[PDB]
Amino acid sequence: SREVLAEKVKNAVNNQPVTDMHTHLFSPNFGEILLWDIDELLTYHYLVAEVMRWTDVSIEAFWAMSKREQADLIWEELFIKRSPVSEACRGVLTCLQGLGLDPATRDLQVYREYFAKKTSEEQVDTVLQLANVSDVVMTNDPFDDNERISWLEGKQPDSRFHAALRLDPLLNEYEQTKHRLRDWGYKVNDEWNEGSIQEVKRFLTDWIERMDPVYMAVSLPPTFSFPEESNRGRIIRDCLLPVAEKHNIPFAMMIGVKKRVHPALGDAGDFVGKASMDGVEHLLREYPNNKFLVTMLSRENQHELVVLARKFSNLMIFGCWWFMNNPEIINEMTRMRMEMLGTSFIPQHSDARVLEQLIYKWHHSKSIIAEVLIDKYDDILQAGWEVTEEEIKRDVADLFSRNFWRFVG
Amino acid sequence: SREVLAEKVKNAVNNQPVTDMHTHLFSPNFGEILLWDIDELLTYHYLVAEVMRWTDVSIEAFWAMSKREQADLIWEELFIKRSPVSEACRGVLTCLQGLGLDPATRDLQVYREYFAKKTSEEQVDTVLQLANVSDVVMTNDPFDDNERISWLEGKQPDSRFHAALRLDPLLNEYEQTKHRLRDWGYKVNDEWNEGSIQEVKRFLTDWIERMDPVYMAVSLPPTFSFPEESNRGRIIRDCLLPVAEKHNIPFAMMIGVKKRVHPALGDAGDFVGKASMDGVEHLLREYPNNKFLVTMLSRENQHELVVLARKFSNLMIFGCWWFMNNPEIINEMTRMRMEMLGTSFIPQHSDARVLEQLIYKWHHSKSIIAEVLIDKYDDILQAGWEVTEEEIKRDVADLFSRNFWRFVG
Amino acid sequence: SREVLAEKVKNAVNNQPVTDMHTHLFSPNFGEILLWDIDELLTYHYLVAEVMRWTDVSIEAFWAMSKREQADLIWEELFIKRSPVSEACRGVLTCLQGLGLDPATRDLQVYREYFAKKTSEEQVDTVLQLANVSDVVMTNDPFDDNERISWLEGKQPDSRFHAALRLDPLLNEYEQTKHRLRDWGYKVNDEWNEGSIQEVKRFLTDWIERMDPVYMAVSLPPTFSFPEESNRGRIIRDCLLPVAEKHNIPFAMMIGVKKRVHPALGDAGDFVGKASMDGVEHLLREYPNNKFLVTMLSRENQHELVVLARKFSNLMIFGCWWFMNNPEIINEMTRMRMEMLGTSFIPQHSDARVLEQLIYKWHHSKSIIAEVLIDKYDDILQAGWEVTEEEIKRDVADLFSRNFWRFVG
Ligand SMILES: O=C(O)[C@@H](O)[C@H](O)[C@H](O)C(=O)NO
Ligand SMILES: O=C(O)[C@@H](O)[C@H](O)[C@H](O)C(=O)NO
Ligand SMILES: O=C(O)[C@@H](O)[C@H](O)[C@H](O)C(=O)NO
Ligand SMILES: [Cl-]
Ligand SMILES: [Zn+2]
């Protein structure tokens, strides 16, 4: 009867349309910022870091190569010279097979043919159908010249794509960012006074109006603290929180990233650190009318984060972020979470940078989540409880989609 | 032959009478402080925290409801609207089934009937028989007005119940507690001098004489330190340790709890934090004639605690406490412990607040411990070693009962 | 087809000759420092710590017993009075069975007979053949009077044994060690100046020339930091690194050991602590022309160490050291590592102190690594990838031998 349960859980999980609440994808009409195709998959920064542990090619020479050459190098170094057993390499193969291509031939030239004959709009339809993803939440940074243009030009995203206002430059680099704000018309002063406060709010409000984001977000360092008499502390306290409450918009904090420990690696140069929970605890307790979405980078912060979620209902924890996005960790995190929170959390997000990743990110995660659900349902079944297929579909819907939409309101 | 071993290990584990060395239960003759019945199980604070993550009912409104209404709300929110897959919810079902009730009907009114027709004394006999628990260690706090009365009135606990002198108010709130001591006749001065020292010892000795506790205990914060020029540091050094050595009574320290991070939740408002091992290390090494029972709340303290037990024989680690009491964690902790300590530790305690919890707490934990034992016995069996059924029963007896009684002496 | 894969992975793993890159063994011709036989196995410090948690025999009385008596005590306490389920006890049995002895008889006197009729050279041939170990890396400390003699007398180690220059006394006890250096002719001054710098380099160079080590090593405390204006910080910066770069010799750092928390236990008296990654991060980034071999003692440092390896190619992480060398931990560590690094790491080393341990250390670890490999190969097989037996043998060769030799150059 566990196998009967297993088949129903797996079916429910596989058929449930997914709302990916955090990615780095863009509506196809936004242009080239939407990365896709086998060359992009292979040049994903997760693989750049991995190839540099093997190749004799210098990092400078690598960045000088064309994307085709980088992709050929990574394919040779990580798939041919050594078996592609890492999670990221495994992911590439899963994407290929899911698209109908054959990893058995190891024919990179043939795989490339598949992508060259399609348009971005077509590949988006293909991938979302294969990955069974109904909604994608973008990461939209108004401080990026390329992204900003699209929004200013009035471009509205595809109905399947949702905006999220990323604020890293504002919160973590205010000393430099303030000057850009001034150039844009927001009259922030040198001192943090009523004027600076109101203009920063104006800036946030203008972009909220323009993007209609499901939430505002920021990635924070292991040393994150709050309250704090710093630009970040003051902006969060005097501008972000008040504005988020007014529009009832959740604040997402991705905590634990130590930026650029290896600058030459670019996007692959970030490290991780354990953070104190004090700041998050204070925010949750002192701002009960604000909603917070949180995910942490350190493996050592995971359990206490689950416990904090038991304390505050205005906290919704989500995903297995970045360095946590590996089977061994996803499994332990998801089990600890269901054990202490039942179904009141968002188990995963893809964080996809390349369109096709939605296939492997969700395929790999769904199989793990399905196994966890099967164990948990079986435990209560052995206790005499009877679970209906509709209750399973309901639970699965909450985990992969409803909890998020319900939280953002 | 692994299945032959499995059946013997499981049989031995299930038939071994358990000594629960830490609970919040009371001898039935102590009165109403002994909580029991389906309504109490459902209003366990672990479930209050969980229901607050789902219900639209305010925490104030919840505390205003009758226990019957709270129980109905929790049943509806956590068992009916979503599958009861969390560890605490699973536990309720296990208790129901163990009592002969049927979770399949989901008939809360029928379950309530079972409890209304029995006396506390009868339910105690029923539960201890079902849970196969021979001895229960209570948590007796002389600073609680309700508990204190029973002891002062000369009430002696049931032979199956043992006393443990809880000292949180004395050690963590001396500034306020000192005044109560004075009102009780213990002449502690404003300054920590010979007089204050002797009167605190007198207080401890009087209660040791009155309760005849198996150990003195205290829960400590993540910031716990020792030695320390504070009330706690001085009381432990000048009073607790000397008195514990004289009567050869162990000192139990439950470390890592951060009290009231969410006051409105009451008992469900405590958080957790990783502690430094420095204080425990110092205590173990500098007080070789004292015995220490230790359990920690942070997942990140578990492995180093096991290593410290390898260093000092006056340290006996026990259980998977509170936020650690979940399958995923219990499994990892128990395996790390057996691997580095063999059978020289106490794997679990229930921490039961409601009588019936003894059923699920021990049922859930025993099945995990049995699987760990089976793996470990199988590994040495494959090495050519032959384990007899009597040796298995012996090992199981040490884990679930003898190690504790042997340690407390 | 998973079983077909399983048989090939297991075969490849078992047949792959192992290069043990860190042990405390010595070439047989070096003399008595090479410990071997059943009495040594039983008196391994891991077991001394374990027996002290059970026996009523004082630690002083234990150290006063002959090695035969200590071995009899440990056998009685840990194998007869309680089942030998701990990892270290399990290891002893694995060694016995591997040598052809029968753990079923529990006849210690008979086992002893096997060893008394052989020479060290013969047992070395026997063990290395059984453990399938082709190369052993020793730990050679020039500050030890016993070891130093052999080297000064011109003794060259067996071709299967390689030297590693251990520098703990120099780096962690310079204030005392400096005086010994002077007595040996190295004119280090009271102040850290050009003269002291050059003489410390001379000392390192002389021993590098004499030992021809594959790397220089040191064990460091949880509080390790760098850069640092201390003897250790200055010696590493001004002498060790420059010299290691010139001879292209890797620097091995075993971090997280807190020495002598329980002095009376001798070698069994060391504890563990979580370290900051700051020092390692700085060393890797600021000294790109230097190579670093790193292993950490704290379970809480493992994941971030893997992430740091993704950042820097001059970092090669290795093994599951000491308190990490237990199935539960080895399994989680190895899976996290393969998931984020593929095959670019050294999964294990034995750290053997007694010759026969090579049998169980490698037997226990190989079975775990084999299971991890099987899961990872199966995941990509399910993705459509086809792995050849030769590619498996290749991958296995990198993990157990080639990655190390390639890194040391
Ligand atoms: O949102 C973030 O800051 C991260 O997720 C980064 O995009 C990171 O580099 C990444 O690729 N995802 O994990
Ligand atoms: O003894 C303690 O301090 C804890 O166990 C508390 O009673 C806690 O609230 C609880 O219910 N048990 O984990
Ligand atoms: O090399 C080291 O410092 C350690 O490995 C010690 O030798 C330790 O005591 C041991 O036996 N190995 O883990
Ligand atoms: Cl930690
Ligand atoms: Zn695990």
Ligand SMILES: [Zn+2]
């Ligand atoms: Zn992201």
Ligand SMILES: [Zn+2]
């Ligand atoms: Zn308790």
Ligand SMILES: [Zn+2]
């Ligand atoms: Zn070693």
